[PDB]
């Protein structure tokens, strides 16, 4: 049994896996209560409390990440790194779904033309990869395409906000990915004109966007492997 911490602060976080990843409670869109129980070695986490009821606005995105999330960096992440300077990028993840609430299980990658992210990613992009969900929750923006990438099929959604938002929603849900080729999504977004290849990738995250509820969702077995050109 690995050591755990129970984090309930709206902006609470823990370094995990010797500093390689970081886990964030990240209740960014509401004041409703949420706790996660975090395994300090693996970075595995489970929602032990989630009282969100936020209409059609995301209340929270409890998540684990490699890289720099609003200027808070993990240890020796190799990011930020320019998109054109990435050779390979893959990730493992396993999620445990629940039978209630309105939520998704989704990667969230953050880009911008700047080398720093302390002030966020305006003028850059956010690339999501939705693997599972409940409650007919929808990506931002408009559906623009359907695409074969990384060994599966995806809906492509795009919004033009302060940053470019691109979401890939899997055509059928899964509970795990093994060596998911994240660069395939990046290169598709570049080809579409949604990400500039001279923008930096700052952070590779995954977690659950929560609109309503969430208790019992679990994130396990996260890994990211990045290779620079």
From TrEMBL:
Disulfide bonds: 8-35, 68-73
The protein, known as: Cellulase
């Amino acid at each position: 049994d690995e050591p755990t911490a129970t984090v309930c602060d709206r902006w609470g976080s823990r370094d995990v896996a010797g500093g390689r990843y970081r886990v964030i409670n990240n209740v960014w869109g509401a004041e409703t209560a949420q706790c996660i129980e975090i395994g300090l070695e693996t970075g595995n986490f489970i929602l032990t409390r989630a009282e969100h009821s936020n209409g059609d606005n995301v209340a929270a995105y409890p998540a684990i990440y490699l890289g720099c999330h609003w200027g808070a960096c993990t240890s020796q992440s190799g990011l930020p790194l320019r998109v054109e300077a990435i050779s390979r990028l893959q990730s493992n993840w396993r999620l445990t779904p629940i039978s209630s609430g309105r939520w998704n299980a989704a990667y969230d990658l953050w880009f911008s033309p700047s080398l720093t992210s302390t002030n966020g990613y305006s003028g850059g992009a956010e690339l999501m990869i939705w693997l599972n969900w409940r409650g007919n929750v929808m990506p931002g923006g408009n559906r623009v395409a359907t695409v074969s990438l990384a060994g599966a099929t995806w809906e492509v959604w795009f919004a033009d906000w302060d940053w470019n938002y691109i979401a890939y929603r899997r055509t059928t849900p899964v509970t795990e990915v093994t060596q998911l080729d994240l660069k395939a999504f990046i290169d598709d977004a570049v080809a579409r004109g949604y990400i500039s290849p001279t923008w930096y990738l700052h952070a590779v995250e995954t977690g659950f966007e929560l609109w309503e509820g969430g208790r019992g969702l679990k994130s396990s077995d996260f890994s990211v492997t990045l290779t620079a050109r």
